[PDB]
Amino acid sequence: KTIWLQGFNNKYVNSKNGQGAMWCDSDAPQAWELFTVVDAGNGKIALRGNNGMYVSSENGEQAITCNRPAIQGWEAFDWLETADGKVSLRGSNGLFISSENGAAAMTCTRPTASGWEAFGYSVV
């Protein structure tokens, strides 16, 4: 299934076509804002961006990216949802992807999920 991800700032997660760090900075979802939800095994998922690569948590040591050709330790996430159907994505470190409210590159550094880590989504 293929989705967009709308952050707390009402902008959309952007793969940046694998060129550097991801940002939640797009006004509307188009090609670079679409991610295919792939089964990563053991009930986890990976997110494949427009460039065919996978989103990586980068161990929470730097901003997340969409440049890996394989699911190799930092690319598997738990899909966790709020009551109204927003999604939070928990990485290998147990930490959540954050939109950072769009004023910084997206990270996977936070151990709890609030607004900045909650994303609206639908299936395309």
Numbering used by the authors: 450 to 573
Question: How is this structure described in the published paper?
Answer:
Carbohydrate-binding modules (CBMs) are non-catalytic proteins found appended to carbohydrate-active enzymes. Here we present a structural and functional analysis of the recently established CBM family 92. All proteins analysed bind preferentially to β−1,6-glucans.
As was predicted by sequence analysis, both proteins form a β-trefoil structure comprised of 12 β-strands arranged into 3 subdomains (α, β, and γ), similar to β-trefoil domains found in Fascin and CBM13 proteins. The binding cleft Arg residue in the β-subdomain of CpCBM92B is found in subdomains β and γ in both CpCBM92A and -B, but is substituted with a Ser in the binding clefts of subdomain α in both proteins. This substitution in the α site leads to a substantial increase in accessibility around the glucosyl unit’s O2, which may permit binding to oligo- or polysaccharide extensions from this position. We also see that the α site knockout shows only a small loss of binding ability compared to the wild type, but that there is some residual binding in the β/γ site variant W523A/W565A, suggesting that the wild type α site does make some small contribution to binding in the full protein. The α binding site of CpCBM92A differs from the other two in that it lacks an otherwise well-conserved adjacent Arg that likely supports binding by interacting with a glucose ligand and by creating a topographic ‘wall’ for the binding site. To probe the respective functions of the three putative glycan binding sites, a series of modified constructs were generated for CpCBM92A, systematically altering the Trp in each WExF motif. Variants with single (W481A α site, W523A β site, W565A γ site variants), double (W481A/W565A, W481/W523A, W523A/W565A), and triple (W481A/W523A/W565A) binding site substitutions were produced using site-directed mutagenesis (red stars in Fig. 3 show the positions of the residues modified). Pull-down assays revealed that the single mutation variants showed the same binding specificities as the wild-type, while the double and triple variants showed impaired or abolished binding, confirming that there are no further unrecognised binding sites in the protein. This indicates that for CpCBM92A, the β site likely has the strongest affinity for the ligand.
